[PDB]
Structure formats: structure tokens, C-alpha cells
Amino acid sequence: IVGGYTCGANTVPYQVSLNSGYHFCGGSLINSQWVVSAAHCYKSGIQVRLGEDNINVVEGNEQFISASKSIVHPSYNSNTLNNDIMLIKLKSAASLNSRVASISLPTSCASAGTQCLISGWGNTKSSGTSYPDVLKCLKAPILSDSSCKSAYPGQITSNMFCAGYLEGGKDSCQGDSGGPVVCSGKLQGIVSWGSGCAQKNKPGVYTKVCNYVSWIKQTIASN
Ligand SMILES: N=C(N)c1ccsc1
Ligand SMILES: [Ca+2]
């Protein structure tokens, strides 16, 4: 997260870290047994880390649970990142508490201009590299479809939306992928891609979760 702020320990209790020997992506807890992340975060041997603040220090509220299965969206296209969504099932149910909690799925899509909370442990610099250890947060509005498509001609589908600031300076970044965009208490986005980070006229691009609620609910119910 570039241009954000330190969330505070466990203030984003649905935020998870995906670990394969190291943190590589975020995710969002949607019930005690299931996490939703980006398809481009897929790999085998994922451990889901819940209750994290400093990802390099055991602080006492963590739960570490291996994934038992991953389900990449049937229409995911790794070339274009269309349908950049996956589900991860936990081998054992998380113990839900005030610091490990699920986030509700949308009942409808969110409007342009709605303010959202974007979070993660990704790079905090728009030129260069610095990774923060504690969770970072950014408040940012959903941008109009036309400004999104103007920023990325030929690359935006109906399964993507943009959020952030066209002036630059505030954005998600590498290492945030798979993590949450929460608006009005609902998981509306997944950190997906962008051009650089926090650059002018290049806002972040997010998977549009509201298009996937039926797929999520049916897939979980059958797996
Ligand atoms: N929002 C961005 N610039 C981004 C997201 C994943 S990698 C870069
Ligand atoms: Ca920790």
C-alpha cells in the first residue's frame, strides 16, 4: 500500500496473509473455512495466516492453517487477468473471534464514489521497494467505469473496477494482491493489478466481487 497508514493491530480482522515460506499475497476470510483471493496468487502448499499484524513477529493472536484445496475461477485468464478470483478452503475451521472474523459478501454491486478500505502488506513505495511488516490501510473511492477504461484502454472488462486517485500518490502495490477492498461492510474488490503503483492516471484495478457472489456461494456449498 502506497500513501496509506498503519491500520492498527487486528483492526482489519478479515485480512489474511498467504504464506508459502514467506508472505506472497493477501486474502479475505469469508467464513470459518474459506478465504477468497486473486487467481494470480494461486500456488500449491499455501498456509493461511489469520489474526496477523506484524507478519514477521508472533504477537499472540495468530492462527496458521494449511489450505486443503484451492479453486481458481473457471474463466480465469492469466494473460488478461479477467476473472482474477480464487477460493481457498482451510484444512480446519478458523476459531472466530474479534481479531479473526469473516467479511460479508455483496448483495449488489457498489457505486462509483463509494469509499472503500484497501489493505495489505505490499510495497509502500511508488519508486523503489520497502515492505512494511505491519498491515497498511488506504481509504479510496471507486472510480467511474469511463475513467478506469480511459486509464487502461483495451484492458478493463466488466469483471474489473478501478479505485484510488487519478492524481497518484495513493494505491495498492506488489504484495497486496489478493487482499480486500471493503465498501459499506461488504467485500466488493480483490487487489488485482495496475501499472506501476500510485502513478498519475494509473489507478489500481480490482476484481469486481459482486459479479461472483453466486459462484462463490455455490462453490463453497458443494466443496
Ligand atoms: N494497484 C496496483 N498498482 C497494483 C496492484 C497489484 S500490483 C500493482
Ligand atoms: Ca504476527
Side-chain angles (χ1 to χ4, degrees), residues 1-32 34-68 70-90 92-98 100-124 126-138 140-144 146-166 168-199 201-223:
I1 303 287
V2 178
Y5 59 95
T6 298
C7 302
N10 310 117
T11 58
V12 189
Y14 52 86
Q15 170 87 53
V16 305
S17 168
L18 307 184
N19 184 289
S20 64
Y22 47 87
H23 165 86
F24 69 90
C25 273
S28 301
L29 192 64
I30 61 164
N31 72 29
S32 71
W34 287 94
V35 165
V36 71
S37 187
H40 85 259
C41 293
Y42 165 77
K43 56 168 75 183
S44 57
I46 293 175
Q47 188 187 66
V48 176
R49 300 191 160 203
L50 308 95
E52 287 280 16
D53 188 41
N54 189 319
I55 52 170
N56 271 327
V57 180
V58 173
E59 296 178 296
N61 298 296
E62 299 88 348
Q63 296 177 46
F64 297 168
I65 306 170
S66 301
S68 59
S70 294
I71 302 171
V72 167
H73 194 273
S75 300
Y76 172 57
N77 183 310
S78 56
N79 292 330
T80 63
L81 299 188
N82 195 25
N83 308 289
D84 192 10
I85 186 170
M86 64 180 299
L87 286 162
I88 301 166
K89 195 179 189 181
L90 306 183
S92 57
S95 186
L96 296 180
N97 61 52
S98 66
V100 175
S102 54
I103 184 73
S104 293
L105 291 178
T107 56
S108 68
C109 299
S111 307
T114 300
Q115 292 290 335
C116 306
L117 183 66
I118 310 176
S119 47
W121 290 277
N123 193 359
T124 62
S126 57
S127 159
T129 300
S130 183
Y131 285 87
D133 303 332
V134 298
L135 187 67
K136 300 296 190 164
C137 278
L138 175 65
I142 299 177
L143 300 173
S144 67
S146 56
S147 65
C148 189
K149 294 184 176 162
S150 286
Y152 299 103
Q155 296 195 88
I156 305 300
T157 71
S158 69
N159 300 310
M160 300 170 193
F161 69 96
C162 290
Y165 300 89
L166 294 183
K170 290 159 129 52
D171 199 4
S172 57
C173 199
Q174 274 71 34
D176 292 323
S177 285
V181 181
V182 167
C183 324
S184 314
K186 307 295 187 189
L187 183 67
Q188 295 285 4
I190 302 164
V191 179
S192 183
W193 62 276
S195 177
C197 305
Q199 301 301 298
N201 285 327
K202 294 293 184 273
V205 189
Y206 299 92
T207 308
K208 191 188 296 179
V209 174
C210 60
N211 290 357
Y212 299 97
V213 174
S214 293
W215 171 78
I216 293 167
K217 289 171 117 86
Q218 296 183 31
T219 298
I220 286 177
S222 289
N223 288 276

